Amino acid sequence: GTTTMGVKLDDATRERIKSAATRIDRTPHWLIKQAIFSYLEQLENS
Amino acid sequence: GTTTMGVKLDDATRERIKSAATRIDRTPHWLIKQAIFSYLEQLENSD
């Protein structure tokens, strides 16, 4: 029960993700999932 | 330019995104992008 979804991002955003992930010793993939869970927690909380 | 990167999501996460996106009149793709923007801003800001 796992699927790969494509997210279309401009190069500026991609580079922001890469830089941020490295700083926190994470992969860009982790960073995106963390982003998703954080935003979902904020929407679902209400 | 533009790049497409694959995010590996389990079905529970995929359905949560779909449900929440519909509730806010958006697509799952938009929601993921918004999540990214919001998280990056919080990550980049000085406290």
Side-chain angles (χ1 to χ4, degrees), chain A residues 1-7 9-44 46, chain B residues 1-7 9-44 46-47:
Chain A
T2 299
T3 194
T4 298
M5 156 144 196
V7 65
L9 301 173
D10 65 27
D11 287 333
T13 308
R14 199 224 320 179
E15 294 312 317
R16 284 177 77 197
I17 292 168
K18 288 159 67 178
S19 179
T22 298
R23 289 191 71 100
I24 66 170
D25 279 317
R26 293 298 194 168
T27 57
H29 189 271
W30 188 95
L31 176 319
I32 296 167
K33 289 178 81 199
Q34 177 81 329
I36 292 165
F37 296 136
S38 294
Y39 196 74
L40 287 181
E41 192 180 356
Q42 277 192 309
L43 295 171
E44 286 164 2
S46 52
Chain B
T2 297
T3 291
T4 304
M5 68 202 74
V7 63
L9 303 169
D10 72 346
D11 292 341
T13 305
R14 188 198 57 209
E15 294 304 332
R16 280 175 71 201
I17 292 166
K18 284 166 72 184
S19 282
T22 302
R23 283 162 70 229
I24 62 161
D25 283 322
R26 294 299 192 166
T27 52
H29 189 268
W30 189 96
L31 184 155
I32 293 164
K33 279 193 75 177
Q34 184 75 345
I36 289 166
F37 295 143
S38 296
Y39 184 75
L40 285 172
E41 194 192 62
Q42 95 118 359
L43 207 48
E44 287 165 359
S46 306
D47 303 323

